[PDB]
Amino acid sequence: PYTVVYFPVRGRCAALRMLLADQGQSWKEEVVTVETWQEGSLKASCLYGQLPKFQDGDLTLYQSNTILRHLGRTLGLYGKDQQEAALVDMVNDGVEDLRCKYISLIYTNYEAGKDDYVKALPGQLKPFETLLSQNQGGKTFIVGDQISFADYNLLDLLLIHEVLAPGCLDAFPLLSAYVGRLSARPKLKAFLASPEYVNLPINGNGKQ
Amino acid sequence: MPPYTVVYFPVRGRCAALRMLLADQGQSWKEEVVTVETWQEGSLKASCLYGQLPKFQDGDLTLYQSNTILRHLGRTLGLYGKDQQEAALVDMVNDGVEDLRCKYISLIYTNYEAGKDDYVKALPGQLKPFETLLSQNQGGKTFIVGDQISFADYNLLDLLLIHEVLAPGCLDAFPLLSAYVGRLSARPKLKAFLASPEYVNLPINGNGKQ
Ligand SMILES: N[C@H](CCC(=O)N[C@@H](CS)C(=O)NCC(=O)O)C(=O)O
Numbered sequence: 001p002y003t004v005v006y007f008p009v010r011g012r013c014a015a016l017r018m019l020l021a022d023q024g025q026s027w028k029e030e031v032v033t034v035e036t037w038q039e040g041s042l043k044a045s046c047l048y049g050q051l052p053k054f055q056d057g058d059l060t061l062y063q064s065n066t067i068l069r070h071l072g073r074t075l076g077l078y079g080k081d082q083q084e085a086a087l088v089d090m091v092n093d094g095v096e097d098l099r100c101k102y103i104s105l106i107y108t109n110y111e112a113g114k115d116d117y118v119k120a121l122p123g124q125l126k127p128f129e130t131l132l133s134q135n136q137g138g139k140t141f142i143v144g145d146q147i148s149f150a151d152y153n154l155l156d157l158l159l160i161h162e163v164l165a166p167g168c169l170d171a172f173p174l175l176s177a178y179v180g181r182l183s184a185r186p187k188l189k190a191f192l193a194s195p196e197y198v199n200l201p202i203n204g205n206g207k208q
Numbered sequence: 209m210p211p212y213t214v215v216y217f218p219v220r221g222r223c224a225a226l227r228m229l230l231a232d233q234g235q236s237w238k239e240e241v242v243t244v245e246t247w248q249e250g251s252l253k254a255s256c257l258y259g260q261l262p263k264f265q266d267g268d269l270t271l272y273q274s275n276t277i278l279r280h281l282g283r284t285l286g287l288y289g290k291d292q293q294e295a296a297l298v299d300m301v302n303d304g305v306e307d308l309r310c311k312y313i314s315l316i317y318t319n320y321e322a323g324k325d326d327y328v329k330a331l332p333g334q335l336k337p338f339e340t341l342l343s344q345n346q347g348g349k350t351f352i353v354g355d356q357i358s359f360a361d362y363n364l365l366d367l368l369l370i371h372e373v374l375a376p377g378c379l380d381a382f383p384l385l386s387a388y389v390g391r392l393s394a395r396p397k398l399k400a401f402l403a404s405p406e407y408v409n410l411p412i413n414g415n416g417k418q
């Protein structure tokens with residue numbers, strides 16, 4: 001019973017939509033334009049003044065990672081046990097930390113900052129290659145042997161980064177292979193090929 | 209040896225909430241402290257997954273990332289809500305807290321003097337959500353989410369205590385948050401913890417700004 005309220009961009013909803021799609025879930029998308037948002041109705045009713053907003057039946061949630069964690073929890077995408085559950089979170093927050101750095105670049109200081117960001121990037125991605133190398137030679141998922149919600153969010157982050165700086169995964173053979181393995185998952189592959197994903201901008205200021 | 213170990217700088221910083229949680233739950237833990245000089249040397253930083261502290265050890269489980277540690281303790285100590293729905297709201301609260309913590313960190317570390325006024329003027333609007341949450345949960349009389357304490361109470365409690373030092377009386381505009389802070393502060397083990405030398409004699413931040 002799902003509904004996504006967001007702007008006409010991929011942004012902080014790309015990973016959760018990836019997840020819904022791969023898990024064969026159905027959801028309603030509700031779009032929010034510039035004048036709708038600016039008016040100030042919807043914003044005044046949002047817990048933190050912001051989007052996405054997510055409905056799951058009688059349940060309203062804000063916060064992209066809360067949404068992720070909720071879906072991981074209820075669809076069984078949160079590790080096999082608490083140890084795994086913790087590694088999942090650790091992966092997600094690293095993903096979130098770098099996503100926070102990406103957004104800063106893109107929205108605040110794209111122009112001058114991009115040169116130094118792409119320089120810092122391999123060191124920012126290494127931790128994830130390391131994680132995979134220690135989890136069955138990288139042949140499965142980021143954590144344990146089943147997909148988790150940190151996989152979708154990590155996958156999103158990897159794709160938007162190959163756009164920012166193509167070839168950035170070249171030096172990382174487990175990440176490269178991981179990205180191709182999950183991309184080829186049938187429902188994910190189709191969603192990533194769909195107009196609904198392809199014809200949406202990554203970001204709001206039209207900088208990718 | 210205690211099963212827990214906290215490897216961090218000699219600061220409250222990102223470990224206050226988890227230390228309060230451990231203290232309030234009556235768990236023992238070991239503090240390994242890292243000095244700037246040990247860090248500058250550079251050897252432990254290269255062992256650190258994301259190259260950062262805090263690092264945490266439950267047995268041979270090495271965790272990084274402070275909210276991950278909190279969620280991990282939230283899961284293993286029963287501080288994550290009663291059902292799947294409460295866990296989601298605990299998460300939405302904690303994510304809310306993490307968002308304001310990040311603005312605060314950017315204030316204190318990369319802009320204190322120019323930013324502080326706008327920051328302290330934007331504050332009431334940042335705190336209101338948390339007052340709203342309380343208002344809608346048994347009229348603000350228990351915890352942030354449901355009727356048992358959760359890990360987000362501890363992170364929210366810490367974030368509130370630090371803003372009260374940054375901008376005293378900011379909770380004056382917020383009667384449930386205030387009652388909230390006083391009510392949680394006075395929990396017996398937490399009370400003793402917040403009055404003890406291991407809490408009191410550490411600075412909130414690394415740069416002595418607060
Ligand atoms: N904590 C973030 C909040 C998302 C956020 O940064 N919201 C932005 C768009 S991605 C927004 O609604 N900006 C419009 C506004 O602040 O009025 C999350 O993970 O969900």
Ligand SMILES: N[C@H](CCC(=O)N[C@@H](CS)C(=O)NCC(=O)O)C(=O)O
Pocket residue numbers: 097221222253259260261262272273274275
């Ligand atoms: N993502 C943060 C990581 C903690 C962090 O930002 N650590 C800082 C100090 S609080 C640090 O280790 N500084 C050393 C460095 O960046 O190299 C978390 O929530 O745990």
